[PDB]
Amino acid sequence: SKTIVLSVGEATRTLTEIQSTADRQIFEEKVGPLVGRLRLTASLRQNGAKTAYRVNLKLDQADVVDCSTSVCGELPKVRYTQVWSHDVTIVANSTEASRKSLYDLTKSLVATSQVEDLVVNLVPLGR
Amino acid sequence: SKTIVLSVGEATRTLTEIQSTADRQIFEEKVGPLVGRLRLTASLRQNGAKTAYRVNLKLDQADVVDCSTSVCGELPKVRYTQVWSHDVTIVANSTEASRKSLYDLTKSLVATSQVEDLVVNLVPLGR
Amino acid sequence: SKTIVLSVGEATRTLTEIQSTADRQIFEEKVGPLVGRLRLTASLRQNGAKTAYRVNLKLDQADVVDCSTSVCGELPKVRYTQVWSHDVTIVANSTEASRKSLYDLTKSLVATSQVEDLVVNLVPLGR
Amino acid sequence: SKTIVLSVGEATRTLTEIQSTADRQIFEEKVGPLVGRLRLTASLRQNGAKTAYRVNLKLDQADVVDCSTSVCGELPKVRYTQVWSHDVTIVANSTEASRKSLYDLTKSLVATSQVEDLVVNLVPLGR
Amino acid sequence: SKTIVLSVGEATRTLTEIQSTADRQIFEEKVGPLVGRLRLTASLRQNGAKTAYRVNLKLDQADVVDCSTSVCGELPKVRYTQVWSHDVTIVANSTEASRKSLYDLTKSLVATSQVEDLVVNLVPLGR
Amino acid sequence: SKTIVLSVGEATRTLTEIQSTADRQIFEEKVGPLVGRLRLTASLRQNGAKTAYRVNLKLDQADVVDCSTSVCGELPKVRYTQVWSHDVTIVANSTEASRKSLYDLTKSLVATSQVEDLVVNLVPLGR
């Protein structure tokens, strides 16, 4: 299979390849309950007349709840569902330096504190 | 207005707010030629019956070419166009710790070397 | 690739992964002649409407014979074929303690002397 | 009748023969509530034209729940059902040493820690 | 992934595994432009009633052309396409010495000067 | 007629032209028994509307067995058959340097130790 190690700061999470296919790669996190966990869908294809390409990356994670600790009968039930898809449209005949600069800019925008505030406090991006 | 500073590694790019509106925020990068540059579209809304929300983030950048350096007449013409949209469906009554963990996982997946290889070498994600 | 070590008592056998696929994992034992050896087929899937799961495990081993030691001319020919399939239907929302107890009971029933007699002497299980 | 003693580590469970028949042997565990307990189905037959044989072994155990301890009225109700069947296709004219080696290999694969992890953590077998 | 190093005499080319699948392995050479490069397709299967096997090996390489050095606008365009497929039908119960002798004969026929002349000067093989 | 000398390392084999024809050249090895020996089929043609060409090269060798050394009476009988065909699709208006580089790369891939292991041990190519 295929293992992916993610560092959150104090613990390390492990995602395992489940559904190995070319047009659809499904990675699932193995921690405890398999239902309602962390899943990742990856897809790669072409477009038009062999011009550019298309990459899709989605990450889902549904929270679960359980009442067997106090209530005398309740199966683990999912609550909400979060969907975070992507879309990469990069042509083949491009530039390695330009692609590296774009990746660095995306990494900086992700690691900046403005997107974190936009996600947490729901405040529009504008600092 | 609203300025956004992005660090690519050796230089700093500046994006300026251009179309300040609630349902559509348009940021445009100011470097030289305004046509065919870096643009960012942000949108925030609700859904259904005041249950969750919907956030959309798109980033476009079209390359330009010019022949006035050698050829004696050619206006700056755009070449290809890249579209990278997003979709955030996070409910209000959620969990701050869960949202922070999801953001950290997304940042780790973005900063990992697998997505960079998938973007550059067009190799399906699976290491 | 993926290696599996099995201890028979005095020697150790090694099975190697050959056909790495999600819906069908084929492990083959590497000792000498690849044709007519030990093979293992593993499969994992879902069922109905995301309720439970389905696991299938089959183990085959066909004996071979050869006459090149005495007779002039005879290629290694397979004789009989043995099929030992399985079927695991365990729901996701279950109990870890119950699953561990069931696995321990299955291990005890396998390691008991009654199933060995049923296999060897073909005597019905009932001691 | 016919009693079977199984050692779990700290306690001993007793299974009693209930439905004594040649083509179908039904063993049932006697602990408390007979409904929703441990049952075992054994079957032995032939195949084709008196060539080989066919042995089937299934083990079922359904969990039960009750609310009479707190709620003032609820009969013991079954929850989920687990099915673990088998299939033995061993020809008569075989080899005692080969059968013993196969049984030892099966016992080792059952007692190994990989199948336990595959059962508990639902991680595919591959260490 | 999987890297393959090929020595042409003065430089070394590197082919990288792209599409890892059992029934179809796609290797792609990484030098510059990914479109119109060196690709290799490998396939392995069985035949009939588990008698022999079937191996297919194809190698493609399409030349590209570009006019951006002089003409002020022309994307890299492919020209011709070359297809060199193979077919290996070797039974399992064969002979290692015979297979080695056949491989040595094939290597000698490939390295001989007659096939090179047949490829270059298009002269029928017959020296 | 047309003789081809192949060096295996310690001995030299001689193949003789037998069926001299334009659309089908059949070379046969002359050592002893003509039936069940080494044969080579060569074919050259065009394609479409005078664009490129098509070259086909197949090499067959069937092993033989005989029992007249011990058994009273048994004619030389063929056992298995091996087929190794080729396909060359090279356009006329190409490049001599590119063709030479491709031939050198093919010779290196043939003489490498990875294809030898793939042929002998039946291990997929990937070192």
Please give the backbone phi and psi of residue E101, each rounded to the nearest 5 degrees, phi first. Answer: -65, -40
Locus of tokens 């580089």: F101
User: Is F102 an 8 Å CB contact of chain E?
Assistant: yes
- Give A40 to chain D, closest Cα distance, Å: 17
CA separation for the pair F45, C116 (Å, rounded): 67
Distance CA E62, CA E68 (A): 19
**Contact yes or no for C92 and A19 at CB 8 A:** no
Tokens at residue B34, please?
């305004």
Question: CATH assignment of A1-127?
Answer: 3.30.380.10
Residue list for the binding site of B for RNA: 39, 45, 52, 54, 58, 60, 83, 85, 89
The residue extents of the domains of chain E are 1-127
Q: For chain C, what percentages of helix, strand and coil (3-state, to nearest 5) are there? A: 20, 35, 45
Helix extents (H) in chain C: 96-111, 113-120
Facing D107 at nearest CB: one of C89, C110, C114: C110
b/e C55-91 (16+ beta carbons within 10 angstroms → b): bebebbbbeeeeeeeeeeeebeeeeeebebeeebebe
Neighbours of chain E (3+ CB pairs under 8 A): A, B, C, F
What is the torsional sign of CA A100, A105, A106, A112?
A: positive
Q: Smallest CA–CA separation between C46 and chain E, in Å? A: 22
Instruction: For chain E, positions 15-44, list CB contacts with chain C under 8 A.
Output: 21-22
What whole-number distance in Å separates Cα of residue F7 and Cα of residue A53? Answer: 49
Q: Identify all chain A residues contacting B116, using CB atoms and an 8 Å cutoff.
A: 103
Find which of D71, D121, D122 to mutate to test the A interface (most A CBs within 10 Å of its CB): D122
The answer for residues whose C-beta is within 8 angstroms of residue F92's C-beta and 6 or more apart is: E122, F51, F52, F53
φ, ψ of residue C118 in degrees (nearest 5): -60, -35
Most A-contacting residue of E21, E28, E35 (CB-CB within 10 A), to test interface:
E35
C-beta of residue D120 within 8 angstroms of C-beta of residue C99: yes
Q: Could you tell me where the beta strands, DSSP code E, fall in A8-99?
A: 12-19, 25-29, 38-46, 53-61, 64-65, 77-78, 83-84
Terminal-residue alpha carbon distance, chain B: 44
CA distance A85 to A41: 9
Using a CB-CB cut-off of 8 Å, the residues of chain A touching C92 are: 33-35
Tokens matching residue A22? 């070319």
**Cβ contact B93:A122 at 8 Å:** no
User: Any known ligand binding at E79?
Assistant: no
Q: Which of F112, F107, F37, F40 lies closest to F78 in space, CA to CA?
A: F37
Question: Which residues of chain A make contact with B85, given a CB cutoff of 8 A?
Answer: 87
- What whole-number distance in Å separates Cα of residue E62 and Cα of residue E55? 23
Contact between F11 and F22 under an 8 Å Cβ cutoff? The reply is no
Annotated binding residue at D91?
Answer: no
Distance from CA of D98 to the nearest CA of A (A): 32
Contacts of A31 in chain B (CB under 8 A): none
Alpha-carbon span C48 to F37, nearest angstrom: 58
The kind and range of the H/E element at D108 are helix D96-111
How many Å lie between the alpha carbon of A18 and the closest alpha carbon of chain C?
Answer: 6
CB-count exposure of residue D84 (10 Å: 0-12, 13-18, 19+): buried
CA–CA min distance E93, chain C (Å) = 6
Which residues have C-beta within 8 Å of that of residue C98, sequence separation ≥ 6?
D61, D63
Q: Are D88 and D54 in contact (CB under 8 A)?
A: yes
Residues 6+ apart with CB under 8 A from E5: E12, E13, E14
Quote the minimal CA–CA distance from F66 to chain E in Å. 16
Tokens encoding A118: 């936009």
Output Rg (C-alpha) for chain D, integer angstroms.
19
**What span, in angstroms and rounded, lies between the C-alpha atoms of D54 and D44?**
6
Q: What is each CA distance from A117 to A103, A112, A122, B16, C42, in whole angstroms?
A: 22, 9, 7, 19, 47
Tell me, yes or no, if F70 comes closer than 8 A to chain E by beta carbon.
no
Neighbouring chains to B with at least 3 Cβ pairs closer than 8 Å:
A, E
Alpha helices in chain E (DSSP H): 96-111, 113-120
Dihedral sign (CA B118, B123, B125, C2): negative
Cβ-nearest to B94 among A80, A104, A111: A80
Residue in E with minimal Cα distance to C21 = E22
Backbone angles phi, psi at E77, to 5 degrees: -120, 135
DSSP letters of D30-88?
-SS-SSSSEEEEEEEEE-TTTSBEEEEEEEEE--EE--TTTSS----EE----EEE--B
Q: D45 burial class (0-12, 13-18, 19+ CB within 10 angstroms)?
A: exposed
State whether A1 and D67 contact (CB < 8 Å).
no
Q: Considering Cα of F111, then F11, then E109, then F101, what sign does the dihedral take? A: positive
| For helices D96-111 and C96-111, angle between their N-to-C axes, nearest 10 degrees | 160
In this structure, are residues B41 and B28 in contact, taking their beta carbons and an 8 Å threshold?
no
Tokens of B127: 């290491």
Residues in chain E: 127
Pair type for strands C64-65 and C77-78: antiparallel
CA-to-CA distance for F8 and E115, rounded, in angstroms? 17
Best C20, C23, C26, C93 residue to mutate vs chain A (most A CBs within 10 Å): C93
Breaks in chain F (C to N over 2.5 Å), named by the residue before each, are none
Write out chain B residues lying below 8 Å of E30, CB-based: 121
Q: How far is C98 from chain E (nearest CA, A)?
A: 37
Residues in chain C preceding a C-to-N separation beyond 2.5 angstroms (breaks): none
Experimental approach: cryo-EM
- Contact at CB, F69 and C72, closer than 8 angstroms: yes
Residue D62: exposure state from Cβ atoms within 10 A (0-12, 13-18, ≥19): middle
> Could A85 and B83 be called an inter-chain contact, meaning their C-beta atoms sit closer than 8 Å?
no
Residue A88: strand, helix, or coil: strand
Give CA E64 to chain center in angstroms.
18
> Nearest CA to B15 among B23, B4, B24?
B4
In this structure, how many other beta carbons lie within 10 angstroms of the beta carbon of residue C28?
Answer: 14
Judge contact between C96 and D120, C-beta under 8 A. Answer: yes
CA distance readout (Å), A103 to A42, B110, D34: 18, 9, 65
Give the Cα-Cα-Cα angle D119, D121, D123 (nearest 5 degrees). Answer: 85
Is the Cβ–Cβ distance between C111 and D107 less than 8 Å?
Answer: yes
Residue F84 phi, psi (nearest 5): -135, 90
Please list every residue in chain C whose beta carbon sits closer than 8 Å to the beta carbon of residue D108: 6-8
Q: Which two tokens stand for residue F89?
A: 């699709």
Q: Is A104 left (phi over 0), alpha (psi -120 to 50) or beta?
A: alpha
For C44, residues 6+ apart whose C-beta sits below 8 A from its C-beta are C22, C23, C53, C54, C55, C56, D124
Helices (runs of H) and strands (runs of E) counted in chain E:
2, 9
